[PDB]
Ligand binder design. Structure first.
Ligand code: HEM
Length: 465
């Protein structure tokens, strides 16, 4: 039929604003889906976007027509500081160049090997100390977790970990949490529509830019330091590596390796490798307290497979199917990045008898995939059985796509999975979770759902086993 997907009729400038709700974009987009189908067109202000709902539609596009959908779309709040630079929000040659360099530079510093595992196990041991540091008192786990997580990716890029007491470190973590929380509030989602005007007006968005400007300034600082303490044959970290390449590409006018890409790519890995994992852990513990029966089974498997003395190791997962189903169930229910990171068609495309012209933005509704009623029997509930078969063995699912799928998929998935398995397991081995309220009253529903999925604020206590 050679034509763009159908959808609600837009008014000038505001688009389909009146047919949406900034506080609940996902729900609003799904409602519209009920009427136009799993694949439709919506206008976020002047942003013409094609929405993909359900596993089938998403896998077809991002995987079956991968190259066609390999373009990177936009996220206005982040593009405020990134402006198309860095590996995450760049396109074409710039993205091809930075992405390839990032993956390799990550493998050279241990990602996917013994070095990174040992670094994660060491940081895990530091979390344990910190948790015992509480003496079982009821606390907000938020920053206990992000400090631990952030130090993993920090080791890669900045060269070493941060001190848990380092106050500038706390400051940087508050900025990351503040930014992810803002992009999920209705104002943050309204800004996705009217950034052209909102970026110049007073309001919460300004505070969000300050936090981004604060993380950039910090990155710029560290880079300068590395720039004047650099050993061109011995790179200390990601930043030194990039610098090496930069010096090596000075006589090339068209290189993609210059200061701005270094700063942004770094700020992106720092933020990306922190908040997403931190949020996942934070939500997961909430879910475990809400479900004692599960915490109990996790303990049975941990005690049996690992014991109480040695540290859990990554390979231990092959022997812990239940613990594996849990982490998946946590990522599925969590739905951390509900609408993934926008994609855009790299060139005119024919999709399911629809025409998508070059440049069209795409919204892969990963949340609609993690809950596709056709791959999970009770999508709305937290049930590890979703990833286990009859004999209690780990069962994979094609609908499991928290890291998205396709050519611009999360290349931090490996590190994230190793972190999630080592952190959850090691904490569960050493503690039992005491929530501050009767399980039945615990609210596991989200506080904010926008660019991210944010669990509700809560306190708990870690009692020694
Ligand atoms: C449990 C944690 C994490 C989740 C749920 C997650 C999720 C995502 C998602 C949904 C995307 C977009 C994929 C697409 O375009 O189709 C993405 C992008 C990416 N992630 Fe993650 N991520 C996590 C952890 C990490 C970590 C630990 C790192 C860093 C080492 C990281 C690095 C990135 C980067 C650099 C991109 C952009 C890739 C590109 O543009 O080609 N992520 N992530």
């Amino acid at each position: 039929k050679g034509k763009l997907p159908p959808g609600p009729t837009p008014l000038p400038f505001i688009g389909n604003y009146l047919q949406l709700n900034t506080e609940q974009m996902y729900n609003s987009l799904m409602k519209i889906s009920e009427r136009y189908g799993p694949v439709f067109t919506i206008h976020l202000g002047p942003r013409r976007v094609v929405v993909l709902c359900g596993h089938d539609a998403v896998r077809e596009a991002l995987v079956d027509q991968a190259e066609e959908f390999s373009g990177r779309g936009e996220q206005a709040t982040f593009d405020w500081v990134f402006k198309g630079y860095g590996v995450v929000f760049s396109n074409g040659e710039r993205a091809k160049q930075l992405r390839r360099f990032s993956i390799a530079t990550l493998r050279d510093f241990g990602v996917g090997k013994r070095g990174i595992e040992e670094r994660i196990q060491e940081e895990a041991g530091f979390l344990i100390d910190a948790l015992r540091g509480t003496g079982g008192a009821n606390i907000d786990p938020t920053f206990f977790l992000s400090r631990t997580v952030s130090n993993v990716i920090s080791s890669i890029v900045f060269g070493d970990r941060f001190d848990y007491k380092d106050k500038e470190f706390l400051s940087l973590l508050r900025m990351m949490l503040g930014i992810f929380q803002f992009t999920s509030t209705s104002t943050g989602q309204l800004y996705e529509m009217f950034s052209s005007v909102m970026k110049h007006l007073p309001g919460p968005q300004q505070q969000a830019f300050q936090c981004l400007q604060g993380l950039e300034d910090f990155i710029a600082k560290k880079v300068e330091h590395n720039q004047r303490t650099l050993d061109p044959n011995s790179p200390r970290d990601f930043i030194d590596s990039f610098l090496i390449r930069m010096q090596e590409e000075e006589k090339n006018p068209n290189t993609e390796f210059y200061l701005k890409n270094l700063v942004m790519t770094t700020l992106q890995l720092f933020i990306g490798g922190t908040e997403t994992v931190s949020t996942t852990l934070r939500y997961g513990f909430l879910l475990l307290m809400k479900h004692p029966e599960v915490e109990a089974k996790v303990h049975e498997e941990i005690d049996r497979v690992i014991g109480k003395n040695r540290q859990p190791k990554f390979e231990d997962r092959a022997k812990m199917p239940y613990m594996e189903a849990v982490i998946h169930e946590i990522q599925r229910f969590g739905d951390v990045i509900p609408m993934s990171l926008a994609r855009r068609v790299k060139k005119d495309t024919k999709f399911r008898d629809f025409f998508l012209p070059k440049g069209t933005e795409v919204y892969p509704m990963l949340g609609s995939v993690l809950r596709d009623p056709s791959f999970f029997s009770n999508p709305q509930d937290f049930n590890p059985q979703h990833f286990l078969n009859e004999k209690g063995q780990f069962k994979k699912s094609d609908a499991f796509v928290p890291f998205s799928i396709g050519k611009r998929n999360c290349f931090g998935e490996g590190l994230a999975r190793m972190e999630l398995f080592l952190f959850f397991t090691t904490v569960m081995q050493n503690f039992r979770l005491k929530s501050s309220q009767s399980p039945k009253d615990i609210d596991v529903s989200p506080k904010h759902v926008g660019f991210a999925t944010i669990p509700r604020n809560y306190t708990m206590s870690f009692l020694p086993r």
